[PDB]
Amino acid sequence: MVSKGEELFTGVVPILVELDGDVNGHKFSVSGEGEGDATYGKLTLKFICTTGKLPVPWPTLVTTLVLCFSRYPDHMKQHDFFKSAMPEGYVQERTIFFKDDGNYKTRAEVKFEGDTLVNRIELKGIDFKEDGNILGHKLEYNYNSHNVYIMADKQKNGIKSNFKIRHNIEDGSVQLADHYQQNTPIGDGPVLLPDNHYLSTQSKLSKDPNEKRDHMVLLEFVTAAGIT
Numbered sequence: 001m002v003s004k005g006e007e008l009f010t011g012v013v014p015i016l017v018e019l020d021g022d023v024n025g026h027k028f029s030v031s032g033e034g035e036g037d038a039t040y041g042k043l044t045l046k047f048i049c050t051t052g053k054l055p056v057p058w059p060t061l062v063t064t065l066v067l068c069f070s071r072y073p074d075h076m077k078q079h080d081f082f083k084s085a086m087p088e089g090y091v092q093e094r095t096i097f098f099k100d101d102g103n104y105k106t107r108a109e110v111k112f113e114g115d116t117l118v119n120r121i122e123l124k125g126i127d128f129k130e131d132g133n134i135l136g137h138k139l140e141y142n143y144n145s146h147n148v149y150i151m152a153d154k155q156k157n158g159i160k161s162n163f164k165i166r167h168n169i170e171d172g173s174v175q176l177a178d179h180y181q182q183n184t185p186i187g188d189g190p191v192l193l194p195d196n197h198y199l200s201t202q203s204k205l206s207k208d209p210n211e212k213r214d215h216m217v218l219l220e221f222v223t224a225a226g227i228t
Helices: 074-079
Strands: 013-023 026-037 042-049 090-098 103-113 116-126 146-153 158-168 174-185 197-206 215-226
Touching (some): 074 215
Parallel strands (some): 013 116
Antiparallel strands (some): 013 026, 090 103, 090 174, 103 116, 146 158, 158 174, 197 215
């Protein structure tokens, strides 16, 4: 009723995530498979580092590795920019600033290829400390729940957001990751321009005890909490 993309998400949708990564010159690639069920705001994904050992901690990649699977309640479906850009899709770009360490620059295309929702990412990381908490793998394998404020970016016919992720360091302190995000339609529209609103997130990271490769299992729920 509201957008050309809502009907594409009414059932379970297969997902493919492909990340090509370059942090300080450490080249790596990550492949993810799973499914999304936007009716319940639900994501299940298993990611594998296809190049060997991941050179950064898995938690630092969670936000980079498909908000079109957020559950928008009925009174919020006019604010669902992510589904409205489908099937052609949207570009999602971020700078992630790790406090007193380096930063990631990410550019992603989120779009359907056939029946599969694809997230194709390029990640660049610069100015990291080779012995620091990130490249030194000093972060705990866990995640917190967040509320993120999505704001309209009328000039770009998309959305923008600033939010903070706090990763646990093994010494009992936290590593701050300042996220700046912008999304824009692929093929220049049309899309729904939302008013400002919150997404509420929660994530559980786990491992497959049978899987020998470096990997991350992710179970995540995202819900449009409302305008306030």
